[PDB]
Design a protein around this ligand. Sequence first.
Ligand SMILES: [Zn+2]
Length: 321
Amino acid sequence: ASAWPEEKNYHQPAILNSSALRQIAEGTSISEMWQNDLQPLLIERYPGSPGSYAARQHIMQRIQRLQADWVLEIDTFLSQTPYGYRSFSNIISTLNPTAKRHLVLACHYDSKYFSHWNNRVFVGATDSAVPCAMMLELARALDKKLLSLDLSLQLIFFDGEEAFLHWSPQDSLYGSRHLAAKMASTPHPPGARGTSQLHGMDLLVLLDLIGAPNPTFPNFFPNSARWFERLQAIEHELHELGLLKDHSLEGRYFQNYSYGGVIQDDHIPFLRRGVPVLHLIPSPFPEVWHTMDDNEENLDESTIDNLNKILQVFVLEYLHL
Ligand SMILES: [Zn+2]
């Protein structure tokens, strides 16, 4: 019985040197992401809504235009909700589908349902339109290097992360609770006797509530702590090389501190099934959290730009690209 599912415990990154770091920094464009990936997503897109459909089309389109051999799958399913049975659609973009191991980046693309209030519409800019755009920008910026790809990359855009009313065990995490169970009962790689797609998930990097100023991401899990340390190292070096904007070490994003409690999010269904998680959600949450003010106007551009650089370097180093 092959011990490949254990390979992740020993996987080491291939650290980029100063020269490569400058390249990655210059290779990403916050303005291009802002206009081409982010703005089309700043629309009402709760599950089953026209916006949900448009958002889904936008995401698939932005991925399809890239050179890398991305395989797109739409995981659609029904589920009971406080408003009765409804349909949901997770978006999965994978490189090298039969690859045994995959580094996974994820976020939810649905927006929390809110009736219009004083002609204002909830669009969840940080929750999670920006994370979506960051994943798209990463796909675009690293496109050439990803084109060269038994460890590959996968992107998951969850639907129904938000509760229709207020959070409850049965009302929230629709897409993730469903996809986790599905992947767990799916043999991987094709033809395997006793390993699933979850055994293939090296690490789940979940981006959420990103885009507000001064975010502080805590080190939530010990079995992914070494990777959290890598993000710190990366932030530190990009900073020392003067590759970040309006950034100070005192105000670093990845700080040396744990967080006991549990935060409900798309990683739960995976974590409770043994998947290693690197949860990139800030604590505290953005002030505008679940507010009509969680819009474009309250986003911090340079902060998002800095994070794209940090994340892209993290992915390349993990993938040895
Ligand atoms: Zn939310």
